[PDB]
Structure 1
């Protein structure tokens, strides 16, 4: 059981030690397409790249590259697309991928500005009457509604294919209260957010994979998926205590490098799963 394993690592403060064994144990696959010189300007950080085998491809013939990985969890029957916060020059690309992958939801776990710097382009409209056009990808994006709460904001967006005149409703879940330094003290508000996305139908196999981003798409995005997947496996299994979070983290890291950036995030992920377990049972 992981609740006993928690106290153990916690009382002995072994979190930096555990996290280093996962660093050591993690997969390394090629990322040749990311390191191509033509794609230098499509990457937010040079040290965070999609693996070739799991990278999402854009259906434009010119350059199919975007910094985005498909995470397939076989046993949980869950998929996620993990991507960097879009750059000013890739907001078109980003909305093309959401179109092409038939995604219902976008989950955002960062503010546009943190620590006085830009962590992300403003890629959605701020006002109903001021829609955005992506000329390069031929998409129009309109704010339909917006429901601001203490910890998170939910927006209803209409994405239209200008080429074909099809329209789709997209939900944007934005967690607005991740602190600039560290992790939340309590996972209550993060668990509330997770369920809010789940109830929306955005995580369901009748839709394309959810799109999940922070700044690099590995730290906070990492915590989102890991909590979702572990909690779902505890429902799916005869013995819920057979679920090892280290095993699941390492299975996710086959798909995208670096998921969970700090020992703090690892601790917080155990805490979210452990608290989340009690809320169900």
Structure 2
């Protein structure tokens, strides 16, 4: 094949964008080439109190449906990329009256992990409801028949992991859910460092929660598009390079935007994605002797 390293094509494109200061023009191309798709159900009058933001809706062809309910609607989208054997659900931070629907979805889809990338309060405004308990009291969701209990808490400098017990009162079953909370990523902002973000993604992966033997993981922030889209694009692109595909980041992002509108919301969020994909690629382990030498010489 080509003479470069596994990440060489992406790294040279990054340097060229920096030197010519072309991050804003590229972000504008992506916005202009993103097609729109029908989102009629989201706009029904009966669903107005189920949406956090009037300008952020799931498309009809990929929305997640609630089963055995009179109104099947939730502001959530299935993003499935079968070239990488990866499936995700991207969703808004639930409102006080949609927390019950959020846990019904987690149960019906056989999810093992929830990845949360926002704080409850940001710049003096509420961004998400308190949908899990912080002490030893059980938290009851009576509309859909679930209860939630805190089992364990592990607090680090820039993220926290909660283990939660989710009880289906109607079926007499419980499951253990892993709750991965990144606590230092600002709204319309970027994480502290590539190294910080990547340590977090490796913890999510090590738990097995993204593997094809579980249901899709639930990823959310406040609207479910800016920070959630950054996390999913970086993870998907790293899987594709691991399997050997020669990838074009603009092309992969446009394809993922066919499943949910607006993923990645600023030019600096796009630039951070390139940096995390390059630095992460240098961490992957494998059997190739050639690949291992590239890693040692680039550290």
Gap regions ≥5 residues in structure 2: 1-8, 285-294
Deviations 1:10-40 (A, max 9, x none): 1111111001111111121100100111001
State whether structure 2 residue 78 is matched by structure 1 residue 70: yes
Q: Which runs of 4+ in 1 moved over 6 A?
A: none
Deviation at 1:181, TM superposition (A): 5.9
Return the alpha-carbon distance in structure 1 between the equivalents of residues 189 and 53 of structure 2.
Answer: 20
Deviations 1:96-123 (A, max 9, x none): 1000100000000001011111110010
- Residue 283 of structure 2 aligns to a residue whose secondary structure is helix
Match among 68, 86, 89 for residue 81 of structure 1: 89
State whether structure 2 residue 48 is matched by structure 1 residue 44: no
Q: How does 1:266-277 map to 2 (within 5 A)?
A: 266-277=270-281
Return the alpha-carbon distance in structure 1 between the equivalents of residues 173 and 192 of structure 2.
Answer: 44
State whether structure 2 residue 111 is matched by structure 1 residue 103: yes
Match among 250, 265, 274 for residue 261 of structure 1: 265
Return the alpha-carbon distance in structure 2 between the equivalents of residues 180 and 84 of structure 1.
Answer: 13
Q: Are the aligned partners of 2:188 and 2:226 in contact in 1 as well (CA < 8 Å)? A: no
Return the alpha-carbon distance in structure 2 between the equivalents of residues 133 and 186 of structure 1.
Answer: 38
Gap regions ≥5 residues in structure 1: none
Q: CA RMSD in A?
A: 1.0
- Residue 78 of structure 2 aligns to a residue whose secondary structure is strand
TM-score scaled by length of structure 1: 0.96
1:261/1:181 CA distance change after superposition, 3 Å: closer
Q: Are the aligned partners of 2:63 and 2:75 in contact in 1 as well (CA < 8 Å)? A: yes
2:191 aligns to what?
184
1:252 aligns to what?
256
1:174 aligns to what?
181
Deviation at 1:52, TM superposition (A): 0.2
Deviation at 1:141, TM superposition (A): 0.5
State whether structure 2 residue 134 is matched by structure 1 residue 130: no
Q: Are the aligned partners of 2:93 and 2:129 in contact in 1 as well (CA < 8 Å)? A: yes
Q: How does 1:111-126 map to 2 (within 5 A)?
A: 111-126=119-134
Q: Are the aligned partners of 2:161 and 2:181 in contact in 1 as well (CA < 8 Å)? A: yes
State whether structure 2 residue 27 is matched by structure 1 residue 23: no
State whether structure 2 residue 241 is matched by structure 1 residue 234: yes
Q: Are the aligned partners of 2:118 and 2:186 in contact in 1 as well (CA < 8 Å)? A: no
Return the alpha-carbon distance in structure 2 between the equivalents of residues 125 and 184 of structure 1.
Answer: 26
- Residue 150 of structure 2 aligns to a residue whose secondary structure is strand
Equivalent residue pairs, number:
277
State whether structure 2 residue 12 is matched by structure 1 residue 8: no
Match among 267, 283, 286 for residue 279 of structure 1: 283
TM-score scaled by length of structure 2: 0.91
Deviations 1:248-279 (A, max 9, x none): 10111010000001111100111110111122
- Residue 151 of structure 2 aligns to a residue whose secondary structure is strand
Q: Kindly name which structure, 1 or 2, has the bigger radius of gyration based on alpha carbons.
A: 2
1:206 aligns to what?
213
Return the alpha-carbon distance in structure 1 between the equivalents of residues 189 and 166 of structure 2.
Answer: 35
